[PDB]
Amino acid sequence: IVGGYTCGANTVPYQVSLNSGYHFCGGSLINSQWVVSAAHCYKSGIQVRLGEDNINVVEGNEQFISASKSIVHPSYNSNTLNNDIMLIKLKSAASLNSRVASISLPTSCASAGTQCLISGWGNTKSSGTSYPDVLKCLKAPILSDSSCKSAYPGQITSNMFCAGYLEGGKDSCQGDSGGPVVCSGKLQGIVSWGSGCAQKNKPGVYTKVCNYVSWIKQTIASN
Ligand SMILES: C[C@H](NCc1ccc(C(=N)N)cc1O)C(=O)O
Ligand SMILES: C[C@H](NCc1ccc(C(=N)N)cc1O)C(=O)O
Ligand SMILES: [Ca+2]
Ligand SMILES: [Fe+3]
């Protein structure tokens, strides 16, 4: 996260870190046994780390659980990033408490102007590389479809939305991928892509979760 602030230990209880010997993507806990992340975050040997703040130190409250299976959306296109969503089933159910909790799925899509919270352990620099130890936070508004499409001509599908600031300086970044975009207590987006990080006129692009609620429920119900 670029231009954000330190969230504070366990203030974002649904945030998870996907780990394979190092943090490589974020994710969101939606129930005791399932996590939602981005399809481009797929890889074998994923360990889900819940209740984390400092990802380099065991401070307590952490729960490390192996992924039993990862389900990338069948229509995911790695070239366009359309349908960039993936479900991860935990080998064992997580112990839910004040520090580890699930986030609700949306019942309706969010409108432009809606303020949301984006979080992650991704790069904090727009021009360079600097990964944080603790979780970073950023409040960003969902942009209008017209502004989003004008920023990324012919690259925005109905399953994506832009959020952030056109002036630059504040944005999600590499390492934040798969992480949550929560608005009014509901998971509305997943950190997907963008052009560089925090660049002017190049807001972040996110997977529009409200379009996948039925798919998520039907998939979880059959697995
Ligand atoms: C999909 C992945 N990119 C991820 C990615 C994530 C966040 C942003 C951003 N500035 N908000 C830009 C990105 O390009 C990749 O290019 O491999
Ligand atoms: C900045 C660089 N991402 C580059 C990038 C380029 C094109 C697309 C796309 N819409 N097909 C997505 C991306 O995430 C990166 O994440 O390193
Ligand atoms: Ca830790
Ligand atoms: Fe990218």
Residue 52 is assigned to a ligand binding site:
yes
Q: Is the CB of 193 under 6 A from ligand 2?
A: yes
Contact at 8 Å (CB) between 28 and 16? Answer: yes
- Atom of ligand 2 at shortest distance to CA of 193? 14
Q: Which homologous superfamily is 13-102+211-223 in?
A: Trypsin-like serine proteases (2.40.10.10)
The answer on whether 214 is annotated among ligand-binding residues is no
Comparing CA positions, the residue from 117, 107, 83, 95 lying closest to residue 29 is: 95
Distance CA 27, CA 17 (A): 6
Distances from the Cα of 110 to the Cα of 96, 116, 142, 211, angstroms: 27, 10, 8, 11
CA distance 214 to 13: 24
Token output for 63: 């729960």
| Site of tokens 């991704």 | 122
The three-state (H, E, C) secondary structure of the chain, written as one string? CECCEECCCCCCCCEEEEECCCEEEEEEEEECCEEEECHHHCCCCCEEEECCCCCCCCCCCCEEEEEEEEEECCCCCCCCCCCCCEEEEECCCCCCCCCCCCCECCCCCCCCCCEEEEEECCCCCCCCCCCCCCCEEEEEEECCHHHHHHHCCCCCCCCEEEECCCCCCCECCCCCCCCEEEECCEEEEEEEECCCCCECCECEEEEEHHHCHHHHHHHHHCC
- How distant is the alpha carbon of residue 17 from its chain centre? 10
CB 138: neighbour CB atoms within 10 A? Answer: 24
Atom of ligand 2 nearest to the CA of 173: 16
> 85 CA to middle of ligand 2, Å?
16
For residues 96 and 102, the answer to whether their CB atoms sit within 8 Å is yes
To test the ligand 2 pocket, which listed residue (162, 195, 199, 207) has its Cβ within 8 A of the most ligand atoms?
195
Q: What are the domain boundaries of the chain?
A: 1-12+103-210, 13-102+211-223
Domain 1-12+103-210 has CATH 2.40.10.10: yes
Angle at 93 between CA 95 and CA 100, to 5 degrees: 35
- Which of 49, 77, 88 is closest to 219 using CA atoms? 88
Phi/psi of residue 189, nearest 5 degrees: -145, 165
Question: Is 19 known as a binding-site position?
Answer: no
138 half-sphere exposure, CB direction, 13 A CA radius: 30
CA–chain centroid gap for 159, Å, is 15
For residue 71, what are the CA distances in angstroms to 22, 49, 190, 219?
21, 18, 15, 9
Domains 1-12+103-210 and 13-102+211-223 share a fold: yes
Tokens of 68: 């039993």
